[PDB]
Design a protein around this nucleic acid. Structure first.
Ligand SMILES: [Mg+2]
Ligand SMILES: [Mg+2]
Ligand SMILES: [Mg+2]
Ligand SMILES: [Mg+2]
Ligand SMILES: [Mg+2]
Ligand SMILES: [Mg+2]
Ligand SMILES: [Mg+2]
Ligand SMILES: [Mg+2]
Ligand SMILES: [Mg+2]
Ligand SMILES: [Mg+2]
Ligand SMILES: [Mg+2]
Ligand SMILES: [Mg+2]
Ligand SMILES: [Mg+2]
Ligand SMILES: [Mg+2]
Ligand SMILES: [Mg+2]
Ligand SMILES: [Mg+2]
Ligand SMILES: [Mg+2]
Ligand SMILES: [Mg+2]
Ligand SMILES: [Mg+2]
Ligand SMILES: [Mg+2]
Lengths: 98, 109, 195, 129, 153
RNA sequence: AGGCGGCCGCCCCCUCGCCCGUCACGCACCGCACGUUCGUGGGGAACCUGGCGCUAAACCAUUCGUAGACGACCUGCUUC
RNA sequence: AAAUGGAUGGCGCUGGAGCGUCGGGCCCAUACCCGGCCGUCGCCGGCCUACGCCGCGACGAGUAGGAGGGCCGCUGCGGUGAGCCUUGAAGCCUAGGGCGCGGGCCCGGGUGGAGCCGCCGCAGGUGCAGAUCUUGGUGGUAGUAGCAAAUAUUCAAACG
């Protein structure tokens, strides 16, 4: 695993996966990580991370989660999963994912 | 300044196959790999220097954690430049593969 | 304080014996590029030997039995362990001094490699004798990273080529400077005592 | 300022360890005292390598330094002041040792008499407050 | 009487003892080892919770065939139980300890159980009627307990 | 299995830092060992001081059953 | 061609770490040579416990078994130590000191509270690791198996 770049706005339905007890917790997950997409320096760091990934990484995977709100179940915790992208070029797979 | 001793490794005691002799130890001195080269080191003093937790008195200066076991080279061993030695007290078995500095105090040439 | 021994061209046992004897003394040995270690005999002969070794396995519980390794670095490690007294504390402590690795990683590409002529195939085997490469032998039995190993080797070779070109340019400039400053540098002592 | 004995040589011991009875470590009913093993297939009796040692006449110490204390004297047990004046002529090689059952009242008298006679005592200044 | 590991400060310590009391020596040893090194209030709360099965006592030394509980994770162990008789006996002993501390003039809130030791007692005997008309022993294992309480601050 | 090195512009300054020669000094400890080194070595508990930042998560209890011999495992809690 | 996976001892070895003929070195046994110490034997030496004190030489393994020594140890008796002890006897414990090759013993320290021991002889119901040994005590098993033959208990209150 070379690098992992997460999105800016992550819903609580997905953030519930990183907690074992959602009631006692303060929902403090990804509070400072979202500031990287707002700060210009954080944006530059994320862009250089993308640039290094374009050159070094060979297998690109996308992390996606389901929407338990639309389901009749009472789980409310989204299942995170990686899906390997089998596109043509590694440089264009990153563009298609972004 | 600068090192004033030769480097030697402790490979093991004088032993056969099913018995050991802790009174005599074998030394592999660096740079000597032949029988005709170990005649210079015959009779040279050797020192096994280690460190302990209780500081002991030293001949020069304040007490230090350093403790040394003294000995000297007795004779040669084999044809591969290995040498023999006999210390005042037998070397501990934990010193196998460690360094015993061969001084140049007894000088003949 | 370390011995970076190259792997290509050396015979398996001829090199492993030297490494096992040198590790028991205290020298930390790192065998690099283990996929190039040659093995005497026919390739099919060595393959049959390795398959006969693979056949040996505990009947009641294979997981709790002989662990057969597929990487050539691990093969060389097991060969050295067969000579080291690994069942004693001395051998257990000496086993960490040996570092067998496939390819030439970043921590070791910049270090100059050593060659033991006592284990070289050129002086050990006749030019008419058959030999087998450990890399191919391992790849034919449960090894999967031969392609990426070769790719990274090609990359590091293309890098070392440019590094050597730069070093050769520096050497040429040094020789030119030596030929240029003939005066003010007599150094008859260097010639009388022969460098 | 201890009492200097006569000339004494460097006493050398053939064996510094005490002989241990066979299998005296596994069972606590077996005392540490040595007993001759008389088994028909015991290892100690036939002296296999790596086993415990058997005491024989070879381990006998030198007769010149036998029964000599590390200080250089040879001890002799006393009970009162009467059996102390007998060591008057042998104060340079023999030394006194007061018995254990001697009271503290009669022990100080023996110590004073030995100090007057210049006789070495192995256990001086004992049982004092 | 005689005590093991007497306190260094006898003015800030109070001792308690129980002799020939009918509980299981093993369960008493486990609950004493679990309660050692704890304030009086915390120890009372822990024993009252053990009595109602709110947190296990970890069985470490005498744990042959002891069923594992989920509340033993606090002690870093897997096997726990809830010995109620030993819990109530140690509670009754801690009550006498508090009483002795109050008599000596000590602070109950700052008291900690620095030492508690339990050992076997003389075993009482009954008989068991087995097959083929055989009689086997049916012996109890009572224990002597002792504890020392000292002010931490 | 990446982090030290090179280049260019300045910064407090610098032409006895190198080789040969020259006048004059210093723990000249009185014959002796464990001396000189990558050590601002690795690890753990605290003490006085400057600047920049952080304000949690697990286990237990409770509930659920897509799981359970007991553990374990899959889930919920917000005042809309 | 033979049944668990596996045996030049293993790793391994092919310009040899294989086979045959050999050379020069090197490795070590309780064997040999030199030297110290202990014991036995032989030869002895001296008018210094004569049952003692020395000197030289050669030898030391051993089941069953046969002898000699014990200043090894336990109990009791006759002498003896102008013996030791409520200012502490026997017994017990001890990372303490020390002796003897050894059986064992001496001293220091802590408990203990009324006897004990050395020397010369005498007499033994005299030395324990075993005997599916006798008696008594205690462990692992183990807080385990087990508290399951004959349909079934529940609610409220009182004395506590
Ligand atoms: Mg597989
Ligand atoms: Mg036999
Ligand atoms: Mg078990
Ligand atoms: Mg159970
Ligand atoms: Mg069961
Ligand atoms: Mg009946
Ligand atoms: Mg083979
Ligand atoms: Mg002989
Ligand atoms: Mg014999
Ligand atoms: Mg006696
Ligand atoms: Mg008393
Ligand atoms: Mg009485
Ligand atoms: Mg009898
Ligand atoms: Mg018995
Ligand atoms: Mg029996
Ligand atoms: Mg009785
Ligand atoms: Mg029992
Ligand atoms: Mg049960
Ligand atoms: Mg019934
Ligand atoms: Mg009532």
């Amino acid at each position: 695993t070379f690098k992992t770049v997460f999105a800016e706005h992550i819903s609580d339905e997905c953030k519930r996966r990183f907690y074992k007890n959602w009631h006692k917790s303060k929902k403090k997950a990804f509070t400072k990580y979202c500031k990287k997409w707002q700060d210009d320096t954080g944006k530059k760091q994320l862009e250089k991370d993308f640039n290094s990934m374009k050159k070094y990484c060979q297998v690109i995977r996308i992390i996606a989660h389901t929407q338990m709100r639309l389901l009749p179940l009472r789980q409310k915790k989204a299942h995170l999963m990686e899906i390997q992208v089998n596109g043509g070029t590694v440089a264009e797979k990153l563009d298609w994912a972004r | 300044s600068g090192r004033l001793w030769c480097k030697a490794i402790f490979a093991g005691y004088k032993r056969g196959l099913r018995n050991q002799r802790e009174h005599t130890a074998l030394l592999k001195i660096e740079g000597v790999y032949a029988r005709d080269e170990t005649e210079f080191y015959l009779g040279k003093r050797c020192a096994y220097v280690y460190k302990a937790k209780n500081n002991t008195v030293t001949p020069g200066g304040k007490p230090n954690k350093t403790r040394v076991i003294w000995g000297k080279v007795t004779r040669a061993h084999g044809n591969s430049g290995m040498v023999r030695a006999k210390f005042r007290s037998n070397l501990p078995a934990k010193a196998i593969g460690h360094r015993i500095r061969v001084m140049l105090y007894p000088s003949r040439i | 304080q370390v011995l970076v021994l190259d792997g290509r061209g050396h015979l398996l046992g001829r090199l492993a014996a030297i490494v096992a004897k040198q590790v028991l003394l205290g020298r930390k040995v790192v065998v690099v590029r283990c996929e190039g270690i040659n093995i005497s005999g026919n390739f099919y002969r060595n393959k049959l030997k390795y398959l006969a070794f693979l056949r040996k396995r505990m009947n009641t519980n294979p997981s709790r039995g002989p662990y057969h390794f597929r990487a050539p670095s691990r093969i060389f490690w097991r060969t050295v362990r067969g000579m080291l007294p690994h069942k004693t504390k001395r051998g257990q402590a000496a086993l960490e001094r040996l570092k067998v690795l496939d390819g030439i990683p970043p921590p070791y590409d910049k270090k100059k490699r050593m060659v033991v002529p006592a284990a070289l195939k050129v002086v050990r085997l006749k030019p008419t004798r058959k030999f087998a490469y450990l890399g191919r032998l391992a790849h034919e039995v449960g090894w999967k990273y031969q392609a990426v190993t070769a790719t990274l080797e090609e990359k590091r070779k293309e890098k070392a080529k440019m590094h050597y070109r730069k070093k050769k340019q520096i050497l040429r400039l040094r020789k030119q400077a030596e030929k240029n400053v003939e005066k003010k540098i007599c150094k008859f002592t260097e010639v009388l005592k022969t460098n | 300022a201890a009492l200097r004995p006569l000339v004494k040589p460097k006493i050398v011991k053939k064996r510094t360890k005490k002989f241990i009875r066979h299998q005296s470590d596994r069972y606590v009913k077996i005392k540490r005292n040595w007993r001759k093993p008389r088994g028909i297939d015991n290892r100690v009796r036939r002296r296999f390598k790596g086993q415990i040692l058997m005491p024989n006449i070879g381990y006998g110490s030198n007769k010149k330094t036998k029964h000599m204390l590390p200080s250089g004297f040879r001890k002799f047990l006393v009970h009162n002041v009467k059996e102390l004046e007998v060591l008057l002529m042998c104060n340079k090689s023999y030394c006194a040792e007061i018995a254990h059952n001697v009271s503290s009242k009669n022990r100080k008298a023996i110590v004073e008499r030995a100090a007057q006679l210049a006789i070495r005592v192995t256990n001086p200044n004992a049982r004092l407050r | 009487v005689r005590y093991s590991l007497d306190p260094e400060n006898p003015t800030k310590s109070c001792k308690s003892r129980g002799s020939n009391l009918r509980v299981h020596f093993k369960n008493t040893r486990e609950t004493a080892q679990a309660i050692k090194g704890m304030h009086i209030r915390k120890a009372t709360k822990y024993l009252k919770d053990v009595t109602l099965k709110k947190q296990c006592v970890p069985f470490r030394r005498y744990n042959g065939g002891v069923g594992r509980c989920a509340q033993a994770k606090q002690w870093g162990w897997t096997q726990g139980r809830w010995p109620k008789k030993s819990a109530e006996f140690l509670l009754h002993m801690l009550k006498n300890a508090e009483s002795n501390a109050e008599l000596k003039g000590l602070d109950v809130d700052s008291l900690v159980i620095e030492h508690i030791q339990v050992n076997k007692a003389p075993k009482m005997r009954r008989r068991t009627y087995r097959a083929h008309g055989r009689i086997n022993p049916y012996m109890s294992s009572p224990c002597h307990i002792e504890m020392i309480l000292t002010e931490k601050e």
